[PDB]
Amino acid sequence: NRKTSCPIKINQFEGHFMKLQADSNYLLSKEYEELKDVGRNQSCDIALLPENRGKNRYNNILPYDATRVKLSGGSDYINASYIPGNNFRREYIVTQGPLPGTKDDFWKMVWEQNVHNIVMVTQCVEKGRVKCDHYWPADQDSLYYGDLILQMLSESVLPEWTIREFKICGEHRLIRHFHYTVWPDHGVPETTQSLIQFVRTVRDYINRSPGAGPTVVHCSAGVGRTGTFIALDRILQQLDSKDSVDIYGAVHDLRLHRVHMVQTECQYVYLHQCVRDVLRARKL
Ligand SMILES: [Mg+2]
Ligand code: NA
Ligand code: NA
């Protein structure tokens, strides 16, 4: 019944987006609403097992059984999902912000899945409410996380993001961690340029890690902000390699694999604004 893709010629995108925004977002809202039920036929029965309750930050934001990531051993559960990219079916893992009680699980996943790049698009605390544990070391001294030892080699705090490098050893690898630090507590970032430049930076590093497993992306719940980051990564790659861009199809594909991947119309609009602004700047 529903469209799975809405490709737009790059030179028609500005006017396409204007058409969507016309009349108080009349058509934009219609297109966005077509995505509403994507993926929603899937269950989350494993995440709901009593043994797993304490492992979910939010008891109503859970991975689908079909696409969840499994930890080795006899407690396999983590609140994390495999997500496709432009390039590969399991190009990302989306997860919640680790809890104090699940940070060892998070690091275990990072080790087992051969992760080399982690993207974080939440603060640990937002207006005094905890959103994510500070699940990495505070300084350069080593610490265990479960059966792994981790050392933070460097921490570089820049105006809109912070980049850390960790050395990890389990049963040695360098991991980079990209922490975007200007996402407002509510709504979308206040400029397009900030997130565009952050995504470009991360994508540069991912491209230099051709051996790596999935890129991990998280916010507090692993929901809209994470979906918006991944959708933007996918769409900007399209702008660099193709004559068409398919924001609708990117969001559709993400929603097939985890709930709330791009979760507000505002985020959907923001993705279109980013693409618009990239194309406008080109024409400089
Ligand atoms: Mg110490
Ligand atoms: Na330790
Ligand atoms: Na929003």
Side-chain angles (χ1 to χ4, degrees):
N1 195 284
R2 76 162 81 80
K3 225 170 284 179
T4 63
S5 172
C6 292
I8 303 158
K9 279 158 198 310
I10 286 160
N11 317 91
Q12 291 186 100
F13 184 89
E14 173 94 46
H16 165 72
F17 182 36
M18 293 167 60
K19 192 179 84 209
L20 293 183
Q21 293 181 290
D23 208 359
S24 297
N25 268 7
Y26 185 71
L27 297 180
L28 187 144
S29 297
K30 283 173 60 182
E31 177 171 288
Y32 179 73
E33 281 188 49
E34 296 181 22
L35 293 160
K36 185 184 132 186
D37 294 321
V38 176
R40 300 287 183 120
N41 300 318
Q42 293 173 107
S43 301
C44 304
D45 290 332
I46 298 303
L48 287 166
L49 292 173
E51 38 255 71
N52 294 327
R53 39 180 224 183
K55 300 176 193 163
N56 295 313
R57 179 174 288 278
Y58 305 100
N59 294 147
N60 65 327
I61 303 167
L62 307 178
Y64 296 133
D65 297 323
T67 60
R68 76 187 179 98
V69 182
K70 298 160 184 183
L71 302 173
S72 70
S75 296
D76 77 9
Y77 180 76
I78 183 164
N79 190 319
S81 306
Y82 292 112
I83 307 295
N86 291 355
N87 304 302
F88 305 99
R89 69 172 290 197
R90 294 184 183 98
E91 200 153 334
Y92 317 86
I93 289 169
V94 166
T95 190
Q96 69 184 13
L99 292 160
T102 71
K103 63 188 188 283
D104 295 347
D105 299 339
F106 174 88
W107 288 114
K108 179 175 175 183
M109 182 179 69
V110 164
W111 183 252
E112 294 188 344
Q113 299 291 306
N114 194 35
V115 173
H116 285 67
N117 296 110
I118 301 164
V119 175
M120 177 170 175
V121 293
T122 184
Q123 305 288 342
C124 292
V125 183
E126 299 173 348
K127 295 183 190 83
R129 189 170 277 263
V130 183
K131 296 297 191 174
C132 187
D133 193 56
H134 190 291
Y135 58 86
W136 64 91
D139 57 37
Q140 285 158 311
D141 293 356
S142 58
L143 287 176
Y144 285 103
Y145 293 87
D147 295 322
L148 295 164
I149 328 173
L150 180 153
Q151 221 181 303
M152 183 170 64
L153 301 182
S154 66
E155 175 173 74
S156 299
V157 180
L158 308 170
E160 298 163 316
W161 52 83
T162 295
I163 300 178
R164 297 170 176 96
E165 189 162 22
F166 300 111
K167 185 165 182 200
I168 184 165
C169 72
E171 204 272 63
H172 319 234
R173 302 189 185 161
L174 299 167
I175 289 356
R176 288 212 174 73
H177 183 275
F178 303 89
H179 184 192
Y180 182 78
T181 59
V182 293
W183 206 301
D185 291 343
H186 298 92
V188 296
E190 331 248 18
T191 69
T192 58
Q193 62 81 26
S194 189
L195 195 69
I196 292 163
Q197 292 308 308
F198 179 71
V199 167
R200 284 174 168 164
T201 301
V202 175
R203 167 50 52 187
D204 198 347
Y205 282 96
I206 297 170
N207 287 344
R208 293 158 172 272
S209 307
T215 300
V216 166
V217 187
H218 78 88
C219 56
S220 184
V223 291
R225 299 186 189 176
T226 288
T228 300
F229 175 89
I230 290 173
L232 188 56
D233 184 38
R234 293 183 57 162
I235 290 141
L236 295 180
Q237 285 172 88
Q238 289 162 25
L239 295 184
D240 290 337
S241 60
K242 311 286 184 268
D243 297 322
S244 200
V245 65
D246 188 8
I247 299 180
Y248 183 95
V251 175
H252 182 280
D253 211 41
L254 302 180
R255 293 233 188 129
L256 284 175
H257 294 89
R258 185 171 171 95
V259 72
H260 305 316
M261 293 292 92
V262 184
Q263 96 187 102
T264 68
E265 196 187 294
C266 277
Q267 290 165 347
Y268 196 68
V269 170
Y270 183 75
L271 287 170
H272 285 75
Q273 289 168 328
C274 290
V275 167
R276 185 196 61 196
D277 287 353
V278 165
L279 300 176
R280 285 171 172 191
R282 271 180 180 181
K283 296 197 286 210
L284 108 185

PDB file of all heavy atoms in Angstrom, residues 51-57 75-79 96 99 101-102 105:
ATOM      1  N   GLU A  51      13.608 -11.015  33.193  1.00  0.00           N
ATOM      2  CA  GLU A  51      15.054 -11.034  33.403  1.00  0.00           C
ATOM      3  C   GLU A  51      15.738  -9.796  32.808  1.00  0.00           C
ATOM      4  O   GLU A  51      16.864  -9.451  33.192  1.00  0.00           O
ATOM      5  CB  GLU A  51      15.651 -12.296  32.773  1.00  0.00           C
ATOM      6  CG  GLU A  51      14.994 -12.689  31.454  1.00  0.00           C
ATOM      7  CD  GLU A  51      14.063 -13.887  31.588  1.00  0.00           C
ATOM      8  OE1 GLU A  51      12.970 -13.760  32.198  1.00  0.00           O
ATOM      9  OE2 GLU A  51      14.434 -14.963  31.076  1.00  0.00           O
ATOM     10  N   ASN A  52      15.069  -9.133  31.869  1.00  0.00           N
ATOM     11  CA  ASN A  52      15.688  -8.012  31.144  1.00  0.00           C
ATOM     12  C   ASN A  52      15.237  -6.620  31.563  1.00  0.00           C
ATOM     13  O   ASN A  52      15.716  -5.651  31.022  1.00  0.00           O
ATOM     14  CB  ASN A  52      15.515  -8.203  29.637  1.00  0.00           C
ATOM     15  CG  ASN A  52      16.280  -9.394  29.136  1.00  0.00           C
ATOM     16  OD1 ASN A  52      17.337  -9.696  29.675  1.00  0.00           O
ATOM     17  ND2 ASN A  52      15.750 -10.095  28.121  1.00  0.00           N
ATOM     18  N   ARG A  53      14.297  -6.517  32.503  1.00  0.00           N
ATOM     19  CA  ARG A  53      13.625  -5.241  32.794  1.00  0.00           C
ATOM     20  C   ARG A  53      14.634  -4.155  33.171  1.00  0.00           C
ATOM     21  O   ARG A  53      14.572  -3.003  32.683  1.00  0.00           O
ATOM     22  CB  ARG A  53      12.623  -5.429  33.938  1.00  0.00           C
ATOM     23  CG  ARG A  53      13.116  -6.364  35.041  1.00  0.00           C
ATOM     24  CD  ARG A  53      12.095  -6.532  36.161  1.00  0.00           C
ATOM     25  NE  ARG A  53      12.727  -6.467  37.477  1.00  0.00           N
ATOM     26  CZ  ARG A  53      12.085  -6.634  38.630  1.00  0.00           C
ATOM     27  NH1 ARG A  53      10.780  -6.880  38.636  1.00  0.00           N
ATOM     28  NH2 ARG A  53      12.749  -6.556  39.778  1.00  0.00           N
ATOM     29  N   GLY A  54      15.568  -4.517  34.041  1.00  0.00           N
ATOM     30  CA  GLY A  54      16.542  -3.556  34.553  1.00  0.00           C
ATOM     31  C   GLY A  54      17.573  -3.126  33.517  1.00  0.00           C
ATOM     32  O   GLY A  54      18.369  -2.221  33.767  1.00  0.00           O
ATOM     33  N   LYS A  55      17.564  -3.785  32.361  1.00  0.00           N
ATOM     34  CA  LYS A  55      18.522  -3.504  31.298  1.00  0.00           C
ATOM     35  C   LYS A  55      17.987  -2.490  30.286  1.00  0.00           C
ATOM     36  O   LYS A  55      18.693  -2.090  29.358  1.00  0.00           O
ATOM     37  CB  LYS A  55      18.898  -4.801  30.577  1.00  0.00           C
ATOM     38  CG  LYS A  55      19.535  -5.829  31.502  1.00  0.00           C
ATOM     39  CD  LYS A  55      19.805  -7.134  30.777  1.00  0.00           C
ATOM     40  CE  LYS A  55      20.134  -8.260  31.744  1.00  0.00           C
ATOM     41  NZ  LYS A  55      19.979  -9.580  31.060  1.00  0.00           N
ATOM     42  N   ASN A  56      16.737  -2.071  30.463  1.00  0.00           N
ATOM     43  CA  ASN A  56      16.131  -1.057  29.586  1.00  0.00           C
ATOM     44  C   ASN A  56      16.034   0.249  30.333  1.00  0.00           C
ATOM     45  O   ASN A  56      15.487   0.295  31.443  1.00  0.00           O
ATOM     46  CB  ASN A  56      14.740  -1.514  29.169  1.00  0.00           C
ATOM     47  CG  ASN A  56      14.802  -2.753  28.323  1.00  0.00           C
ATOM     48  OD1 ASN A  56      15.607  -2.819  27.393  1.00  0.00           O
ATOM     49  ND2 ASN A  56      13.980  -3.769  28.660  1.00  0.00           N
ATOM     50  N   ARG A  57      16.584   1.311  29.740  1.00  0.00           N
ATOM     51  CA  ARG A  57      16.473   2.624  30.379  1.00  0.00           C
ATOM     52  C   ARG A  57      15.004   3.079  30.440  1.00  0.00           C
ATOM     53  O   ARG A  57      14.537   3.639  31.443  1.00  0.00           O
ATOM     54  CB  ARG A  57      17.309   3.645  29.599  1.00  0.00           C
ATOM     55  CG  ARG A  57      17.230   5.036  30.173  1.00  0.00           C
ATOM     56  CD  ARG A  57      18.200   5.997  29.455  1.00  0.00           C
ATOM     57  NE  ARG A  57      19.586   5.712  29.804  1.00  0.00           N
ATOM     58  CZ  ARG A  57      20.184   6.143  30.910  1.00  0.00           C
ATOM     59  NH1 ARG A  57      19.509   6.881  31.801  1.00  0.00           N
ATOM     60  NH2 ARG A  57      21.460   5.828  31.129  1.00  0.00           N
ATOM     61  N   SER A  75      23.525 -14.623  29.138  1.00  0.00           N
ATOM     62  CA  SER A  75      22.616 -13.475  29.151  1.00  0.00           C
ATOM     63  C   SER A  75      22.828 -12.596  27.923  1.00  0.00           C
ATOM     64  O   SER A  75      23.673 -11.727  27.924  1.00  0.00           O
ATOM     65  CB  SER A  75      22.772 -12.639  30.423  1.00  0.00           C
ATOM     66  OG  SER A  75      22.416 -13.379  31.573  1.00  0.00           O
ATOM     67  N   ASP A  76      22.083 -12.869  26.871  1.00  0.00           N
ATOM     68  CA  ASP A  76      22.382 -12.276  25.556  1.00  0.00           C
ATOM     69  C   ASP A  76      21.836 -10.880  25.290  1.00  0.00           C
ATOM     70  O   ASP A  76      22.120 -10.305  24.223  1.00  0.00           O
ATOM     71  CB  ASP A  76      22.009 -13.208  24.405  1.00  0.00           C
ATOM     72  CG  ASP A  76      20.515 -13.245  24.138  1.00  0.00           C
ATOM     73  OD1 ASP A  76      19.752 -12.423  24.722  1.00  0.00           O
ATOM     74  OD2 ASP A  76      20.110 -14.094  23.320  1.00  0.00           O
ATOM     75  N   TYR A  77      21.109 -10.330  26.258  1.00  0.00           N
ATOM     76  CA  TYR A  77      20.253  -9.178  25.981  1.00  0.00           C
ATOM     77  C   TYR A  77      20.978  -7.848  26.151  1.00  0.00           C
ATOM     78  O   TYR A  77      21.553  -7.570  27.216  1.00  0.00           O
ATOM     79  CB  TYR A  77      18.973  -9.172  26.827  1.00  0.00           C
ATOM     80  CG  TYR A  77      18.139  -7.955  26.476  1.00  0.00           C
ATOM     81  CD1 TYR A  77      17.400  -7.925  25.296  1.00  0.00           C
ATOM     82  CD2 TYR A  77      18.141  -6.819  27.286  1.00  0.00           C
ATOM     83  CE1 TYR A  77      16.654  -6.798  24.937  1.00  0.00           C
ATOM     84  CE2 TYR A  77      17.412  -5.673  26.932  1.00  0.00           C
ATOM     85  CZ  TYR A  77      16.679  -5.682  25.754  1.00  0.00           C
ATOM     86  OH  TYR A  77      15.966  -4.571  25.382  1.00  0.00           O
ATOM     87  N   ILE A  78      20.864  -7.005  25.125  1.00  0.00           N
ATOM     88  CA  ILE A  78      21.176  -5.576  25.263  1.00  0.00           C
ATOM     89  C   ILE A  78      20.148  -4.789  24.460  1.00  0.00           C
ATOM     90  O   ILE A  78      19.643  -5.264  23.436  1.00  0.00           O
ATOM     91  CB  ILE A  78      22.620  -5.242  24.794  1.00  0.00           C
ATOM     92  CG1 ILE A  78      22.953  -3.765  25.003  1.00  0.00           C
ATOM     93  CG2 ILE A  78      22.872  -5.722  23.362  1.00  0.00           C
ATOM     94  CD1 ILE A  78      24.427  -3.488  24.938  1.00  0.00           C
ATOM     95  N   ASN A  79      19.800  -3.604  24.945  1.00  0.00           N
ATOM     96  CA  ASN A  79      18.853  -2.766  24.202  1.00  0.00           C
ATOM     97  C   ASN A  79      19.608  -2.098  23.060  1.00  0.00           C
ATOM     98  O   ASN A  79      20.181  -1.000  23.236  1.00  0.00           O
ATOM     99  CB  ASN A  79      18.222  -1.734  25.126  1.00  0.00           C
ATOM    100  CG  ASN A  79      17.069  -1.018  24.472  1.00  0.00           C
ATOM    101  OD1 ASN A  79      17.147  -0.677  23.304  1.00  0.00           O
ATOM    102  ND2 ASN A  79      15.988  -0.815  25.211  1.00  0.00           N
ATOM    103  N   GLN A  96      20.527   2.380  23.345  1.00  0.00           N
ATOM    104  CA  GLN A  96      20.197   3.383  24.347  1.00  0.00           C
ATOM    105  C   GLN A  96      21.490   3.916  25.000  1.00  0.00           C
ATOM    106  O   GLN A  96      22.561   3.313  24.909  1.00  0.00           O
ATOM    107  CB  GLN A  96      19.286   2.767  25.413  1.00  0.00           C
ATOM    108  CG  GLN A  96      20.005   1.746  26.281  1.00  0.00           C
ATOM    109  CD  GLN A  96      19.103   1.048  27.290  1.00  0.00           C
ATOM    110  OE1 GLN A  96      17.865   1.125  27.226  1.00  0.00           O
ATOM    111  NE2 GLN A  96      19.726   0.370  28.238  1.00  0.00           N
ATOM    112  N   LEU A  99      23.205   2.424  31.011  1.00  0.00           N
ATOM    113  CA  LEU A  99      22.897   2.601  32.420  1.00  0.00           C
ATOM    114  C   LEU A  99      24.143   2.220  33.221  1.00  0.00           C
ATOM    115  O   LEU A  99      24.999   1.499  32.720  1.00  0.00           O
ATOM    116  CB  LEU A  99      21.753   1.659  32.808  1.00  0.00           C
ATOM    117  CG  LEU A  99      20.382   1.988  32.188  1.00  0.00           C
ATOM    118  CD1 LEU A  99      19.474   0.763  32.236  1.00  0.00           C
ATOM    119  CD2 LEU A  99      19.737   3.170  32.903  1.00  0.00           C
ATOM    120  N   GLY A 101      24.290  -0.023  35.294  1.00  0.00           N
ATOM    121  CA  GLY A 101      24.266  -1.476  35.308  1.00  0.00           C
ATOM    122  C   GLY A 101      24.435  -2.155  33.959  1.00  0.00           C
ATOM    123  O   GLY A 101      24.565  -3.384  33.906  1.00  0.00           O
ATOM    124  N   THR A 102      24.439  -1.377  32.867  1.00  0.00           N
ATOM    125  CA  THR A 102      24.606  -1.956  31.541  1.00  0.00           C
ATOM    126  C   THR A 102      25.845  -1.461  30.802  1.00  0.00           C
ATOM    127  O   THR A 102      26.061  -1.858  29.676  1.00  0.00           O
ATOM    128  CB  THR A 102      23.378  -1.754  30.608  1.00  0.00           C
ATOM    129  OG1 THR A 102      23.285  -0.372  30.228  1.00  0.00           O
ATOM    130  CG2 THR A 102      22.086  -2.218  31.281  1.00  0.00           C
ATOM    131  N   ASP A 105      27.941  -4.314  29.574  1.00  0.00           N
ATOM    132  CA  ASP A 105      27.260  -4.906  28.424  1.00  0.00           C
ATOM    133  C   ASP A 105      27.527  -4.108  27.148  1.00  0.00           C
ATOM    134  O   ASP A 105      27.776  -4.676  26.077  1.00  0.00           O
ATOM    135  CB  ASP A 105      25.731  -4.935  28.651  1.00  0.00           C
ATOM    136  CG  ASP A 105      25.313  -5.757  29.845  1.00  0.00           C
ATOM    137  OD1 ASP A 105      26.110  -6.625  30.278  1.00  0.00           O
ATOM    138  OD2 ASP A 105      24.151  -5.564  30.320  1.00  0.00           O
TER     139      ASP A 105
END
